[PDB]
Amino acid sequence: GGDEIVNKVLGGXXXXXXXX
Amino acid sequence: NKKLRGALSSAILSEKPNVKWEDVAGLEGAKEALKEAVILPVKFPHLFKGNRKPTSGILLYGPPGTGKSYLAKAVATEANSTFFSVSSSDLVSKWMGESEKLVKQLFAMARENKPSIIFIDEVDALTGTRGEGESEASRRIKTELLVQMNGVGNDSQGVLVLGATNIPWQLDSAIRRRFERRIYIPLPDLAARTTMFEINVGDTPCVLTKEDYRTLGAMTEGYSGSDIAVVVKDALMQPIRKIQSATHFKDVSETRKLTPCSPGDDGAIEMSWTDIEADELKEPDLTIKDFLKAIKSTRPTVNEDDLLKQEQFTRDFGQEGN
Amino acid sequence: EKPNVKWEDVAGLEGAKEALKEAVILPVKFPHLFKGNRKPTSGILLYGPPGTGKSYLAKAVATEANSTFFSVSSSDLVSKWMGESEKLVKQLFAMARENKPSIIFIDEVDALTGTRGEGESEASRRIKTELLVQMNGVGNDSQGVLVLGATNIPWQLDSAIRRRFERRIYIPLPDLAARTTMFEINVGDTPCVLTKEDYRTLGAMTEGYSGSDIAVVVKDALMQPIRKIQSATHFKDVSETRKLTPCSPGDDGAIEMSWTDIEADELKEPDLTIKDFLKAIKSTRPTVNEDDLLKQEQFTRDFG
Amino acid sequence: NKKLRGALSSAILSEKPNVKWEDVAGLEGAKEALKEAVILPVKFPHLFKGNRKPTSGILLYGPPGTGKSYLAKAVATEANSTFFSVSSSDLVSKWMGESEKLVKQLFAMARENKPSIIFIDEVDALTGTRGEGESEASRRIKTELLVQMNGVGNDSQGVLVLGATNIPWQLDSAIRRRFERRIYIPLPDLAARTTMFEINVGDTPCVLTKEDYRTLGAMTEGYSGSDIAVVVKDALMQPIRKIQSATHFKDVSETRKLTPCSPGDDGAIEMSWTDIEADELKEPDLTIKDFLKAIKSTRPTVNEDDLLKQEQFTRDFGQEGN
Amino acid sequence: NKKLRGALSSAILSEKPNVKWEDVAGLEGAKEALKEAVILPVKFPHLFKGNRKPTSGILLYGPPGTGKSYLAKAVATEANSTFFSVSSSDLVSKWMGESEKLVKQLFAMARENKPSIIFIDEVDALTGTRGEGESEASRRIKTELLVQMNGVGNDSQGVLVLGATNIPWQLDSAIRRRFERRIYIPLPDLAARTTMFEINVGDTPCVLTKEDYRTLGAMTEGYSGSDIAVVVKDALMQPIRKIQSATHFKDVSETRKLTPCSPGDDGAIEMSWTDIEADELKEPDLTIKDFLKAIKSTRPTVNEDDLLKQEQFTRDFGQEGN
Amino acid sequence: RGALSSAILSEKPNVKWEDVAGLEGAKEALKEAVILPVKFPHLFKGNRKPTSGILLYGPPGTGKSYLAKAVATEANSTFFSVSSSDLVSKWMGESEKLVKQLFAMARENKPSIIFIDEVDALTGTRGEGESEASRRIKTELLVQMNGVGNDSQGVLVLGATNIPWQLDSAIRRRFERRIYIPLPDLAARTTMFEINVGDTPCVLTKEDYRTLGAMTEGYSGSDIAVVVKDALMQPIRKIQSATHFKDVSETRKLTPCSPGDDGAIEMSWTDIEADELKEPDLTIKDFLKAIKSTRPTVNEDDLLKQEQFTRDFG
Ligand SMILES: Nc1ncnc2c1ncn2[C@@H]1O[C@H](COP(=O)(O)OP(=O)(O)O)[C@@H](O)[C@H]1O
Ligand SMILES: Nc1ncnc2c1ncn2[C@@H]1O[C@H](COP(=O)(O)OP(=O)(O)O)[C@@H](O)[C@H]1O
Ligand SMILES: Nc1ncnc2c1ncn2[C@@H]1O[C@H](COP(=O)(O)OP(=O)(O)O)[C@@H](O)[C@H]1O
Ligand SMILES: Nc1ncnc2c1ncn2[C@@H]1O[C@H](COP(=O)(O)OP(=O)(O)O)[C@@H](O)[C@H]1O
Ligand SMILES: Nc1ncnc2c1ncn2[C@@H]1O[C@H](COP(=O)(O)OP(=O)(O)O)[C@@H](O)[C@H]1O
Ligand code: BEF
Ligand code: BEF
Ligand code: BEF
Ligand SMILES: [Mg+2]
Ligand SMILES: [Mg+2]
Ligand SMILES: [Mg+2]
Ligand SMILES: [Mg+2]
């Protein structure tokens, strides 16, 4: 597949890697 | 860009729920303030030129179930402007730094369609006085609200931030400064109770009169509008309970207008409402006994100390709605 | 999601049965009635002690209404992400209004929120206020969608939530006829020698129990014969082609063997009797407390 | 780089809100400090050479609704510089390590467009003493602000970081070190209230005098600037309410200018204001009774323990800004 | 593979901020440690042969605003080597694996350009004791930092990892093991304050003497270096306020070198300073009254609890920096 | 592919078995596990199988990477010193292909040994972490650590961890030998001082080394090394305190002395050329000053957590 981009979420952190 | 507008397009309501100003009983000062602040800049824009500016935010606080959202429905009905009905699920997002962009896009969409109304229902769930709550959500959402309401490079002209809360003493001092008119919505009096009975009876066949409604409104003291609505619904469902819990029936007089009766009458035919077809059922007439039974059946919901706290907040930083 | 429980499968609860019956059957069968000011009920709270057939009655309404059902719970509407435990409720009410008329069953509404007193204030306030706005709101027009809420602790709710719930119906402890009917529907189609007076004496003996307790003592009294078949020795051949039956060690031809050499479809299963139910009720103890009944009495006393 | 610049290009305001230095009443120390640190290096650059350097950061704190954003608007009006107005929505992003490059590109654009003024409204949201906040984004954005303000390889010369917060004791100690001048914006005194009344009334036709303005400024004890603005707004709104309740009109004097009066007078043309067309109305003059009614109707906003906390922070780590 | 070096080439500064060892007031132990860290292995390479190795990491810690970045500037000025000034915005990337490949390429460039100095300001942002933070960024960045600091197959010989942080107790234990020199930079003492006043005043013509500087240093009890810098800035800006808010100038001794004085003198010409053109400007000289007013106006920033935390960290794992 | 040309080292750092002070059980376990399958290959067949997993843990800075360097020196085998930087890529699937080709090259280069420093960077306990770069890599390492029947002859995995309680339980169970590296005792302290001083001239004796090791109560290996470094740097500071130099004995070897002596030539120190400066000798007072200066880098919470971990998984 293509590249994998790291994102950021919020808890109440983590890495939800939403790729393209 | 497209994602935020596609998520915030659902907040605009176009159904226009038909609640007129006559459908709300009492609240004369709140009615006058909302009437001028939504009608006069739309109808006569030449009266506010330069030094005189309209109201830029109204807080409607009080006990729960007093007609705050009903008054907001009346404003959304006879506003003739764009109405934004937002809540906690439409602004708060999962990602980091997404709720503030949603609030900014909401106010930018409301500024493109001037005049517009933003009805943030339950502002107490989004404002928690910045003391001890969640750091990211609390500080960033409240900071974006405080910047986006007036700010510096915003120039919010032609918007209105309607807010309805039940615990207004748990709001931030800056947010209480932002909301200009803090109008108290107190418990209704005898005239508003009789008016609520007269608008909740509708056009159903009843034998109740003006003195009957006055005695009913004298009996339902200490109640609220939701309690008056549920005793009206219970008194409306009492003849259907008399329909269902009856065996002896009776056909009186046009094309079999049949009604229940006592056991033993003129033509005491015993059958069932399942055997009764359509266009032949006649309900029993209303009286004061069904309304008194509903009043004795349903208990009030408002306590007596939160009213003292609401009176304390009114005497501190509140107007009078009456 | 469709169960198979009719109206007759619930024992007792006459007022709750007639209230749910009229409130979910009267619009869907007689559309010529609800016109004008006549609007159906848009909320029902079924509280009381736990295990007293609340979800069973909810499944009965889910069967007999012939409409779409939603049977989510408290743990389904609680997430760990920030602001994701309210979009689930929004999509729930959206898919409810998509398939109108619909019935929404929410279990443990006391555990859904935390009455915003001491717990997580942000999540509690957002969950509670999004539930209220999805219940009535302004542009949410909930007509035909019935919110059917059930709980075990009603006094830990919010004033706004108990205002949103119209009819607060109390599910009390079962009665004598309810206990006998629950025994009669729990025993099933097993070969039994029990009579109506035996059921009446059993229901007189089990006063103070619950429906789940009656179900588990019926399961115990049904499992005790097949338990005594396995946990016994010195079987006895009675009478027709090797009909074996366990007895005491030492009898008129007490054949000492196991159940492995017993041929299939010839082992005589002993019928269940009164002493199995007496052993079950002497083993099983009541589970409920005493102050919770006082709390239910107080809650009915100011929200009857 | 270019995507971040395209995202940050909507931060330079090109509106220039017309608020002059005479519009702000009181706050002489804050006025003088902002006046030197904005006007002097861009007007007389030959003085600041060698050992004399201008102020690189000013923090404005106090109770909510005192004139911090108004002073920022006056600075943005009379600055003649590229005024950067950012908040917690332009810096925080969704991706990993993209909120720091936003602040770096913001300070790079501020250095590329020197002299520039950066106004960060509500600095308490970004900086939270880095004790127990959300680790990655919070601590990285705090250390990125601390590096980009003075740092080592930056040498921020010509830029100015203005701060405006309501709760200043939640600021980080290093950020409080960076804000080298803590100016307390207090509640206004009698002369500032009288000047705010004279400014907010302004060119409105009224019979109010200096003694009336002095009595109003003596009457509004404990009020703030937004409270004075809303009581002036209510006093201006009251003649339209008198026009609404205007039975028995009286045409006094040119081209039929109608004026209400008592019911029954000379020329008492009893009608309403709905059928009267525009461009001929005459509003009644403003008296002190309408302003006293607005004072009795609208309450102050701030309480008397938040002022104690602000005075405690002032006497601990700040100076008095009159 | 070359774009990483192109992105990391912006971290090597070439401006050379002119901060010498005589500019730093005090901190003789930290200056001697930095001297024996950087000056000796390039000037006398015949001493560090065999089992004698130079220092491979120095952690500067203390209260906010004590001179850690100033000593970093002095090291970058007097080092005559490659100086790497990186932060959290130059290591964290949006993609996956680039956040560690950037650190690997940074240490590869530092080992390729030996002797080189890596200065990481605010090391507490990258090292957050890996117990509760973000899993990917925290664990991978901390482990790659440890491996690039010593590792197994790296052999970091000749590079120096400088670090300056205000929170030394929030470091990882492995990072604290890596930093083999914990140098505490405290608040300056009396002689350091007097020499800092002598440095910051400079060549400005003043009537102050060594006894005046001694009384100023005795007056500033508990001040920091930035506080001394801003009271010097305020006392230097005080003659501008003197020439602004005064009239009745007088030519003293030269093409009309006129000076503000008392109203009424030998030629008290009443005019404005704005009409006075440049180079006929004789501003009043500095006295001890202006510095006393600057001390009375500006307040110390550092509290007395963070000093206890730094003292506990010194008594736990720290040296002294005099 | 060809990007794994930096995971193997060809430097072979000269750290012998005598340089590692103390740690006798870990040293003999690593010694047998790296030598005896190469020494006597007939001893390991069938039931008596060699050790396929070795894990080292303890306080930070105790000799784990030093023992790995000693194994890489005295192993005579292909050393794969690789970490999480060469296992994760920007794409998808290549993060698994890297571990697959890594184990393929390690099986092709038998006998080899794989040393993973800081193995907790790969084991984030998969709570809510990155899925495609955490869980798939962990399952790939779990199925490539299944060489109890595949790699009976060949590779051997290592591990060095400062914080071992935050480790995945599957890979913890897959690592069959877990050796606890403690703080060194008095004899290890004395021979570590003897090794770190080395061929430097001194007047320190065995009693001086013993009282130095008795003074270092609770110190670590890196702390002992920086104390030795400070004691080596102290004569340079004494030369830098240049006052009243004095020539000793070839071709003008100068030495500073006390102020006021016989032949106290008062001059500077930078005016003299190199290779004629007779530096002062190492006493015990500069060592005591380095002890008073340098603080122990470990605390008591890490020690009790290490004790809890070894009493839970000894
Ligand atoms: N003054 C009133 N006139 C008419 N209806 C009212 C009035 N007050 C309350 N009600 C009824 O009570 C209900 C509660 O309205 P709402 O404003 O939603 O309460 P809250 O916002 O406090 O939950 C509404 O459905 C409305 O029909
Ligand atoms: N009144 C009742 N009538 C019929 N069945 C009942 C009754 N009370 C309990 N039961 C039986 O007990 C079982 C457990 O009840 P449950 O649904 O868990 O109670 P609740 O709804 O309070 O959680 C159900 O399967 C149901 O069949
Ligand atoms: N000190 C002041 N001088 C003049 N007008 C003021 C002052 N304080 C408040 N006002 C008036 O009240 C308004 C409120 O001030 P504003 O800038 O909104 O304050 P804030 O910083 O709290 O947002 C101003 O826009 C102005 O019209
Ligand atoms: N010890 C000091 N010696 C000389 N100047 C100092 C000293 N401490 C502070 N200063 C002055 O104050 C400024 C603030 O110190 P700085 O290096 O920015 O500290 P920090 O590392 O906390 O950011 C310096 O740039 C310098 O102008
Ligand atoms: N057993 C030992 N023998 C000799 N020196 C040691 C020993 N243990 C620790 N040291 C010293 O402390 C350092 C710590 O070891 P090193 O491999 O660098 O890191 P780590 O132990 O943290 O993996 C060694 O480089 C050496 O200077
Ligand atoms: F003080 Be203001 F509300 F910003
Ligand atoms: F504010 Be400094 F970096 F101590
Ligand atoms: F214990 Be070491 F830092 F690997
Ligand atoms: Mg409401
Ligand atoms: Mg403001
Ligand atoms: Mg610094
Ligand atoms: Mg190591």
Numbering used by the authors:
A (entry chain G): 1 to 12, 18 to 25
B (entry chain D), D (entry chain C), E (entry chain B): 112 to 364, 369 to 437
C (entry chain E): 126 to 364, 369 to 433
F (entry chain A): 116 to 364, 369 to 433
Sentences copied from the publication:
The large and diverse family of AAA+ ATPases (ATPases Associated with various Activities) includes multiple members that form hexamers and are believed to unfold protein substrates by translocating them through their central pore. The structures of several AAA+ ATPases have been determined by electron cryo-microscopy (cryo-EM) in the presence of engaged substrate, including the mitochondrial inner membrane protease YME1, the disaggregase Hsp104, the chaperone ClpB, the TRIP13 mitotic checkpoint regulator, the SNARE disassembly machine NSF, the VAT archaeal homolog of Cdc48/p97, the proteasome, and Vps4, which associates with the positive regulator Vta1 to drive the ESCRT pathways that mediate multiple membrane fission events in eukaryotic cells by disassembling filaments comprised of ESCRT-III subunits. Here, we show that the mechanism proposed for linear, extended polypeptides is also compatible with translocation of more complex substrates. Structure determination showed that a primary segment of the circular peptide binds indistinguishably from the isolated linear peptide, while a secondary segment packs against it in a β-ladder hairpin configuration that passes through the hexamer pore without distorting the Vps4 structure or making intimate contacts with Vps4. These observations indicate that AAA+ ATPases can translocate two chains of a substrate, such as would occur in crosslinked chains or in ubiquitin conjugates, using the same mechanism as for an extended polypeptide.
Because other regions of the cF30 and cFF30 reconstructions are essentially identical, we used particles from both datasets to reconstruct a combined map at 3.6 Å. The overall structure superimposes closely with the previously reported linear peptide complex, including the same helical arrangement of five Vps4 subunits (subunits A-E). Although details of nucleotide configuration are not definitively resolved, consistent with the earlier structure, the subunit AB, BC, and CD interfaces appear to bind ADP·BeFx (ATP), while the DE interface density is ambiguous, but could be ADP or an ADP/ADP·BeFx mixture. The density and refined models for the cF30 and cFF30 peptides are essentially identical, with two polypeptide strands passing through the Vps4 pore. The pore loop positions and the substrate strand with the strongest density (primary strand) superimpose closely on the earlier peptide F complex structure, except that density for the peptide now extends both N-terminally and C-terminally for two additional residues. The density is consistent with the peptide F sequence binding in the same register as the earlier peptide F complex, with odd-numbered residues binding to an array of class I pockets and even-numbered residues binding to an array of class II pockets. The returning strand of the circular peptides has weaker density, indicating that it is more mobile.
